Amino acid sequence: MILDKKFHGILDQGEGVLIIFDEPPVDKTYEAALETIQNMSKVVDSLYNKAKKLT
Partner 1 sequence: AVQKVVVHPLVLLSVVDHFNRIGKVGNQKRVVGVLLGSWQKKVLDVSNSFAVPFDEDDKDDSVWFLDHDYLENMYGMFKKVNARERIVGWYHTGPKLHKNDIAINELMKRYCPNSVLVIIDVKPKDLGLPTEAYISVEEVHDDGTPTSKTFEHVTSEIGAEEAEEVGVEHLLRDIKDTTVGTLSQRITNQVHGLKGLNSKLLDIRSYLEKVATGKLPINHQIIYQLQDVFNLLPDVSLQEFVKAFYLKTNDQMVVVYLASLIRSVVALHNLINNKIANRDAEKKEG
Partner 2 sequence: LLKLFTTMELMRWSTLVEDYGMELRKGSLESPATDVFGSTEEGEKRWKDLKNRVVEHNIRIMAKYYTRITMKRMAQLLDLSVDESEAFLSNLVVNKTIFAKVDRLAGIINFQRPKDPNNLLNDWSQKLNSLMSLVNKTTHLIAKEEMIHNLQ
Phi/psi for 51 (5° steps) reads -65, -30
- Identify residues 6-25 at the interface with partner 2 (CB under 8 A): 15-18, 21-22, 24
Kindly tell me which of 10 and 39 has the beta carbon lying closer to partner 1.
39
CB 18 within 8 A of CB 9: yes
Please list, in sequence order, all residues whose beta carbon lies within 8 angstroms of the beta carbon of residue 19, skipping any fewer than 6 positions away. 9, 10
* Contact pick of 39, 41, 48, 51 for partner 1 (by CB under 8 A): 39
Residue numbers at the binding site for partner 1 (CB under 8 A): 28, 32, 35-36, 39, 42-43, 46, 49-50, 53-54
